[PDB]
Write the structure tokens for this entry.
Amino acid sequence: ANRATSAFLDNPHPVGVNYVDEGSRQFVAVAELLASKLIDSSRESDESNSDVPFVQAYSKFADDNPRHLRVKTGGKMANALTNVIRSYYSINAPAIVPQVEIDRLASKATVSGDMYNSYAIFNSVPIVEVLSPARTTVSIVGSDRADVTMLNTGAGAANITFNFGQIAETVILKGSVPFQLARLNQPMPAARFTYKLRPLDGPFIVVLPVGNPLVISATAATRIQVPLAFNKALVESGFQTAMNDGLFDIQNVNYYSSFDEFIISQYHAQDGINRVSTCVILGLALQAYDQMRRALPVRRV
Amino acid sequence: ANRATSAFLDNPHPVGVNYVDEGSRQFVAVAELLASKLIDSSRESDESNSDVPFVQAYSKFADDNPRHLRVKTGGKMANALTNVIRSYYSINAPAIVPQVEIDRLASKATVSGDMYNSYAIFNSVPIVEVLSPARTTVSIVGSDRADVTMLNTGAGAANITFNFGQIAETVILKGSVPFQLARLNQPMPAARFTYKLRPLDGPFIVVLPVGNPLVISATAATRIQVPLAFNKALVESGFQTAMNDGLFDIQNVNYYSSFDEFIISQYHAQDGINRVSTCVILGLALQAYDQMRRALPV
Amino acid sequence: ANRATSAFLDNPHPVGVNYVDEGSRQFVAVAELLASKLIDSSRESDESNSDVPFVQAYSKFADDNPRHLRVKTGGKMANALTNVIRSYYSINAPAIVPQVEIDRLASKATVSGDMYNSYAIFNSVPIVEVLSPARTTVSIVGSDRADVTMLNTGAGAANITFNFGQIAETVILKGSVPFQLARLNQPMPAARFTYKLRPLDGPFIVVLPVGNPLVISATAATRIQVPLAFNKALVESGFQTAMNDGLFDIQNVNYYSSFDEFIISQYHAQDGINRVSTCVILGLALQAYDQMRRALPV
Amino acid sequence: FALAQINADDEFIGAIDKESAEYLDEYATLARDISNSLTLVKAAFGPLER
Amino acid sequence: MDVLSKGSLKELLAHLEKTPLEEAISYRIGTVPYQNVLISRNEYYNQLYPDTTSLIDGVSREGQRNVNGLIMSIISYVVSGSGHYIPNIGFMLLRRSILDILTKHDTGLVTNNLNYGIIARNLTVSKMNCEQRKRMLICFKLLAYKDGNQNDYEIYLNQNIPLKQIAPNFIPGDMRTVIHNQDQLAIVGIPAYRLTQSTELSIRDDNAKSYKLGYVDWYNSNSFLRERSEFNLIRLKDRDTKYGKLNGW
Amino acid sequence: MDVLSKGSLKELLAHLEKTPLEEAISYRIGTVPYQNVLISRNEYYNQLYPDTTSLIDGVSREGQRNVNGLIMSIISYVVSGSGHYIPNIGFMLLRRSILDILTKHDTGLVTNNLNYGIIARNLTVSKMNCEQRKRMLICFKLLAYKDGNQNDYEIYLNQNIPLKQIAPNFIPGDMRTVIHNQDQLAIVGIPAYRLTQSTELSIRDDNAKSYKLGYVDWYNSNSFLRERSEFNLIRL
């Protein structure tokens, strides 16, 4: 009867369909590589007590030698990168970057826009639906570690069906007390604390005894193809920086607590294979954004 | 009415007021730089089957050659680094290390003591107060992810007031079931799963219907100016080690699970901007402490 | 409910989207620099008895030598400056001047057209709306100093809502007799003559006692980024000259008493940020127009 | 084919090239002279008419 | 970029002869033409910068499939350097030159019902500069002569006084008029003023500066053609000659 | 500047012998201490920066005319380079040097019945660094030994363990302890390399930095300017 679902999986907004070609991917890859040099040069400048390494690196990134009074922000490369990031997030984004600028910026470094060289593990738990009987209450909280608290007020033991989707590879389940769980139309095993499940096996049935509530903690692992320069720590920081600076405030879009929740949510949708490819490019662009903004701080408190 | 507040935001103890000048900040930056070279040299020593790289690195850090019979404490720099960490945590710490020692250790390397050339994001959720009417029970659990559980036993729907402070930049607010939330003196919108909010634009009201409890998860991000060499992975490891080593065992102080909880709690004091700079310098010292202690365990 | 607004804030007309590139901005800055030297040449003509300083400066400005036969107009630079001003005011005005001519005129001097290296203070008072109950009468008069006259004829006291917009930095309120103003959902303060408000905080409630009329005088200050060569006195004089000369005579536009009212009215549009940049360039051009037309009147 | 080798070893004292450093410096003296001469001629002769 | 660098009418008309219609089409999805958007301009403001998208831009935009859209995409190519997205045009049209589309009856396009006022509003004319407006009037004149609606061209010019003054003076069928023209139609070129690498606020202005800075790099690249230094290396067809004539005309 | 530059117990005590009490006190009214204020630090933040005014800020503050006010003014001069405003002290006490006020019975001042805990609280001992703490304890020991209150000095040190660790090692009556003392008490001094001309957040930190930066210029250009005024005059 009752149906419960994860909050972050509901209504994934469409992603952009622009700047997804070979030349555009080279522009994103070049930006990440040159932004990395910007951070490294700034550290070296501090150690050597000379601004030459930073001035030299900023000249490659921004194609200009800065003046003292004018604030340093990155120039055309920063402008193009910031607007392209907006275009990836939603369809409604203006997408106002010319192709001449993209081609010129992609020619700064000899790098390849390969977004399928390696993989990464994304630990967000997808709970598509949890179907429960009438006298039982189910609440789902959390995304990185989902805690499903279920209480059986009914007279007899109830069966609750778990649907974790088909994208995730491994889901590990732990409970406050040992509990019974098995696949659809299969014998119930002995009560155990921990289960390791393949989400493709099928809907899973859990037995809820009458009495104290049972809380099941869930953890998932999904593998998504990403470039070899992908760094999850830098991507998350860039995602927060972009959200705070107001680059994602577009009409009719969904806001996610992490890039982990964003990429998994788009995966768990129709044409999700194509959506993930765009989201991966957005991830590397966000990684470039974080490195570039940390080396060139503008906001003051 | 009932008031609920975050545990980590209650009674932030005063931080130390010493070793925050330019000379002392250069000492901390030098300590981090030399500690990083110590870790790198040990790795190079293992790879090349020679102790020459480690001897040079330890000689610069400790001003003495390593010896097989003696123990590798780290020298006077290790003692000074431990003492400044104690003074940073609380104002009741002794703060014994003299200035002539601080200046002599800052002259080992040439690094600026700038602590405002970059920024870092701290994902701690400040919930200053959650005002609740009678018959409604509100519980706040967690700091990195704050889960607020509310249920009403009354006949009608209740209004719950949320205050997230004036420091956090954005707060993303996710509920177990769709719920309505709006600012003061604003129409209530249709129920929806997620909300993005700026804590600055006044308190927020959430309509709580009668029935099953509503659990709402909060996530916040705050930008604080930090040095370029800041590393949250290293700082958090150093925070745990210093707490394990008793560097923070001073009377009339509070304790925190992680460094981000410490920096947000001190930010939310009566005048929190005073303590942020001192807390930031403490973070860089803990990063140096973590690298040095891993190379030279005791 | 009666709603009263400032007269100058209504229906801002679209501004021109031309001559805002780097080359055109350098042309306006060159015109300001060369018109300044033209005025100074008159004084340098008085220290001696010759007209060589004026002839020298006119040739630089107009690309032609002055002649006693005809009235000194200004040459190609005068026509370009006049037409560019018209294109700034309204989008219906044609962009007559070619870009090749502007590029040629921009090479006369080596100035850089950076229009965001300074700021200016603008004293127009934005009153978006004043909402009053049925029995009360409210009249708003003036732009530089807003005199709001309110009379209460009902039995009880009335609450009047003031909305000063979200652009002005500070607003100072002075009343004929002491009055009470508090922000929404805040307790009323005691009666005072002077209130200092930040418009971003929220709408303000004013208590109107029954009896003699109460008049409130408002003064506002707004900071807008302007070029360093900006001279507010010179800009205002040029605006009056351009209005008198008929440079602004074009269908479907709004007319303003001063450049203070013009820039604030544009800033308070739906997308007023993009209008302010064009308005500032118009002010610099108007500053050059004032200096040039005073030296060479037609 | 006949590519000569340029040593340029004795020119550098450590990482400093004395001759290049000294040659760049005399341009600062030239810059001072240019401004000094230009202003003195302008004051002595004023506007020029032909 | 190459089209925007053409200064004379002879150079522009020669370029439209060589260039096939496919360069006017973009093949990229773009976005909706007229829409109020918030863009990021961090060099000037922290707050997002409001702007309105338009057809005359350096980026692809969605265009109508009819003959009206095809004409508009040609004009947008000439005045802005980038065309529109018109899906599934036949290969016969795409291989034809731009000049053939505007001035020949062999193509199957029917343009007799074209309204010049509607097109001028869609390709926003209040936003164009003087050189862009002159290029548009060249395209309108070529369409009028092919269609026989030369009177409709004149009535349109009489309704707009500034356009009549700056209207290029040539006969679309006589080459002698083209050679005599002294009009300058170069949107991009070598700048006499100092041109920096800073960004601009409006989408049109920022996009135009990208083309301006790109041309300077293209000017100093090896692809640029220096007549005074390599004139003997040029093919006889592409060498500058006084007797060069367009096909027909 | 001269007092903060002394780096030894011998030099500090010698300086206090040659310095009249007029230099310790100031004739500027200043402001009342212990006030929560907002100051401007545009180097770092756009918003105003909170701080609390204290007696060791380095800026003259109003003080009472009792014995405690005079002692607090002297200690502030030693640790911050500037004293407080005590109205109409009198010519009799102004001519006396600082050490005689601290360690002599001929000044006519009753310095007994002095509470070191109250004085330390008023001087914000929790905010001063090791060198400033050391200098404050030196003044306390001189006052205690002159009035025969060595027990009260020891009681104060026992209650404050952090101050007991860094207590000075000299005995006021013995000269051998003064000469062999190895304490470092130099707040300011000529530094190797240089220090950036940048502001600091705290009132104490910024004022202390202003003393360090100006010490180098004061060191080179003080002899002639002082001599011009000193010539043709009689010392107090």
Observations:
- Chains D and B do not touch (no CB pair under 8 Å).
- The first helix of chain D runs from residue 18 to 45.
